[PDB]
Amino acid sequence: AGRYEIRFSGAGGQGLILAGVIMAEAASIYDGKQAVQSQSYGPRGGASKSEVIISDGPVDTQCDALLALTQEACDKYSADLKEGGVLLVDSDLVTKLPPGNYQTTAFNIINTAKNDVGREIVANIVALGAMVALTGVVSKEAAEKAVLSRVPEAFVELNRKAFQMGFEKALAAKK
Amino acid sequence: RYEIRFSGAGGQGLILAGVIMAEAASIYDGKQAVQSQSYGPEARGGASKSEVIISDGQCDALLALTQEACDKYSADLKEGGVLLVDSDLVTKLPPGNYQTTAFNIINTAKNDVGREIVANIVALGAMVALTGVVSKEAAEKAVLSRVPEAFVELNRKAFQMGFEKALAA
């Protein structure tokens, strides 16, 4: 057993809460684990984050993985990421990489969503596919079911595509 | 040091309502807040619960939109704690020294506003009226930033009606 913590950080309107929520429900509803999802407020602009903690057991410090969609998020949040932890950033926007030893993967998350899928707002779904690929914390099936259950029927193809592409590109971009 | 739980069936937007409370309290009221949902191995079955905590720097209030959620989390609610239920779905109340408000929250959404799926906002309006943990204007503003722009007015009415019926009940 053991708790595993992921943080999704970036900017306010990026859908970080939803990503957190999707990850939590992938683990518990679908993968049979326990999970807690949450976000703190207290000055609410600047770089922001939502958190998820998953465990084979009860899930009531340093995080194991971190998404940063903005330089600001990366600057603000990387210090918490444990050494050798998963660091996923957007490569267009996070151009200055942090000091520290991290399993670092970088790709055009936002632009994948915007240009490949053709729907910028689902960049968080791209990142979620990427985060699932890199951490292996939940099955691809669990995450896919969780993603698609939080999406409108009319946009269901685009989100599947975003998720798959995030998944694919993270695998190919990593060291 | 206030805690509020929004319970019902998954799909009723309990999470969104918690997020709104947190933002009303923090982005608009300058306070501190944390919002969260926890999930067990058995998560789909039954109901869903989200939580909000607001600071100046067992919970105090509980919303139950369904009678199952009212069976699950009722025990959790404090003594003399604010309790708010949909008087249509919760037709069997748990024993406890609760300060209770009960009306047709869902039916207010579906029958008066026109959209049943804004029930959470109706509940949210009622919650702010009772607890008084955030100013009305902060909750009204936080709602507007986080509902669909094109459903804005319906949501404003839902919040206002929940708030009204709450004080009237």
Alpha helices in chain A (DSSP H): 16-25, 71-77, 109-111, 123-135, 140-149, 156-173
Which of A7, A29, A30, A53 would you mutate first to test chain B, the one with the most B CBs within 10 A?
Answer: A29
Residue B24's identity, in one-letter code, is A
Whether the CB-CB separation of A24 and A54 falls below 8 Å is answered with: yes
Residues forming beta bridges with residue A51, ordered by sequence position: A7, A38
The two most distant CA atoms of chain B are separated, in Å, by: 42
C-alpha distances (whole Å) from B150 to each of A141, B138, B146, B147 are 34, 20, 11, 8
Residue that the structure tokens 């990142």 belong to:
A127
Breaks (C-N over 2.5 A) in chain A follow: 43, 60
Count residue pairs from A and B with Cβ separation < 8 A.
64
Residues forming beta bridges with residue A81, ordered by sequence position: A63
Which residues on chain A are in Cβ contact (under 8 Å) with B25?
41
d(CA B62, CA B73): 8
- Residues of chain B whose beta carbon is less than 8 angstroms from a beta carbon of chain A are 15, 19, 22-23, 25-27, 30, 32-41, 43-44
> How does strand B61-64 pair with strand A34-41?
unpaired
Domain A1-175: CATH superfamily, name plus number: Pyruvate-ferredoxin oxidoreductase, PFOR, domain III (3.40.920.10)
Does domain B1-169 bear CATH number 3.40.920.10? yes
d(CA A65, CA A6): 5
Whether the CB-CB separation of A40 and A91 falls below 8 Å is answered with: no
What kind and span of H or E run contains A49?
Answer: strand A48-55
Long-range contacts of A135-138 (CB under 8 A, 24+ apart): A135/A4, A135/A6, A135/A64, A135/A65, A135/A86, A137/A4, A137/A6, A137/A23, A137/A27, A137/A54, A137/A65, A138/A23, A138/A26, A138/A27, A138/A30, A138/A31, A138/A33, A138/A54
d(CA A84, CA A16): 23
d(CA B139, CA A59): 30
Calculate the CA A95 to chain-centre distance: 18
d(CA B155, CA B163): 12
d(CA A148, CA B120): 22
Q: Do B36 and A37 touch (CB under 8 A)?
A: yes
Q: Which of A35, A37, A41 sits opposite B32 (nearest CB)?
A: A41
Q: Which of A28, A33, A41 sits opposite B26 (nearest CB)?
A: A41
d(CA B69, CA A126): 34
d(CA A87, CA A84): 9
**Helices B14-23 and B136-146, packing angle to 10 deg:** 130
Supply B168's token pair.
């009237």
d(CA B137, CA A52): 31
Distance from CA of B48 to the nearest CA of A (A): 11
Structural determination approach: X-ray
What's the start-to-end Cα distance of chain A, in Å? 27
In 3D space, the residue among A62, A77, A121 whose CA is nearest the CA of residue B148 turns out to be: A121
DSSP sequence for B65-113:
SSHHHHHHSTTTSPTT-EEEEETTT--SPPPS--EEEEE-HHHIIIIII
Residues forming beta bridges with residue A88, ordered by sequence position: A67, A105
Angle in degrees, CA B146, A52, B11, rounded to 5? 45
In 3D space, the residue among B102, B77, B97, B69 whose CA is nearest the CA of residue B3 turns out to be: B77
Whether the CB-CB separation of A51 and A5 falls below 8 Å is answered with: yes
Q: Which of B22, B37, B41 sits opposite A41 (nearest CB)?
A: B22
3-state DSSP assignment of residue A82: strand
Q: Do A44 and B38 touch (CB under 8 A)?
A: no
From the CB of residue B68, how many other CB atoms can be counted at a distance below 10 Å? 17
Closest residue, chain B, to A51 (C-alpha): B36
Angle in degrees, CA A19, A137, A37, rounded to 5? 40
Distance from CA of A174 to the nearest CA of B (A): 31
Residue A140 phi, psi dihedral angles, 5° rounding: -60, -40
Supply A131's token pair.
């985060």
Residues 6+ apart with CB under 8 A from B63: B4, B5, B6, B7, B8, B84, B85, B123, B127
Alpha helices in A80-139 (DSSP H): 109-111, 123-135
Supply B118's token pair.
């804004």
> How does strand B61-64 pair with strand B48-55?
unpaired
Residue that the structure tokens 């009860």 belong to:
A58
d(CA A142, CA A59): 19
Q: Is A68 left (phi over 0), alpha (psi -120 to 50) or beta?
A: beta
Whether the CB-CB separation of A107 and A169 falls below 8 Å is answered with: yes
DSSP sequence for B111-150:
IIIS-GGGHHHHHHHHHHHHH--S-HHHHHHHHHHHS-GG
- Judged on CB neighbours under 10 Å (0-12, 13-18, 19+), B97 is exposed
Q: Do A28 and B40 touch (CB under 8 A)?
A: yes
d(CA B69, CA B85): 10
Long-range contacts of B84-89 (CB under 8 A, 24+ apart): B84/B123, B84/B126, B84/B127, B84/B130, B84/B166, B86/B119, B89/B65
Residues 6+ apart with CB under 8 A from B136: B128, B129, B163
Residue that the structure tokens 């669909």 belong to:
B148
Residues forming beta bridges with residue A5, ordered by sequence position: A53
